[PDB]
Amino acid sequence: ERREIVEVNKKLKQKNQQLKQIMDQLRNLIWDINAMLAMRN
Amino acid sequence: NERLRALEDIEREIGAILQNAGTAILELSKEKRLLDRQAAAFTTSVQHVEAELSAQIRYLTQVATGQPHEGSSYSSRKDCQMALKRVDYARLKISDVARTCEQML
Numbered sequence: 001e002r003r004e005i006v007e008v009n010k011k012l013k014q015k016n017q018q019l020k021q022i023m024d025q026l027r028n029l030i031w032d033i034n035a036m037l038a039m040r041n
Numbered sequence: 042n043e044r045l046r047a048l049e050d051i052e053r054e055i056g057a058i059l060q061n062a063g064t065a066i067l068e069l070s071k072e073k074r075l076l077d078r079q080a081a082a083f084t085t086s087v088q089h090v091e092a093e094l095s096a097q098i099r100y101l102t103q104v105a106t107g108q109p110h111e112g113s114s115y116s117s118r119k120d121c122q123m124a125l126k127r128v129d130y131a132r133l134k135i136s137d138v139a140r141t142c143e144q145m146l
Contacts (some may be wrong), residue, residue, distance in 0.1 A: 015145075018141075018144070018145040021084075021117070022138065022141045022145060025134065028134070029134040030135065032130070037127070
């Protein structure tokens with residue numbers, strides 16, 4: 001019962017960590033594109 | 042554009058006229074039909090090649106003073122290079138994000 005809840009919480013935390021790792025690169029690419037296309041001309 | 046093809050055709054015609062003159066002289070001096078017409082055509086082609094060469098030499102002489110048409114759109118070349126570099130960086134970042142997502146799932 002409680003062990004299953006703890007394991008689910010650990011899995012959710014790992015998934016959230018991977019999600020944040022992906023979002024870091026996502027926002028990095030967004031900033032890079034939006035800042036490089038702005039210096040055009 | 043068309044002047045290059047014109048000069049190439051003029052050179053080919055000069056070569057053909059030389060060949061035709063040689064062949065006509067050979068046929069006329071071999072023994073004694075169409076040698077007269079052949080010699081006439083060879084002379085006409087030689088005169089035409091000479092006229093074409095004289096006309097090409099008597100061109101408008103665009104500049105003849107300095108290096109003309111200075112500037113080969115280097116700005117556009119650099120802009121295209123930067124656009125290609127942007128596309129490449131976007132592709133690399135997208136591949137990195139895809140690898141991260143694949144490692145996630």
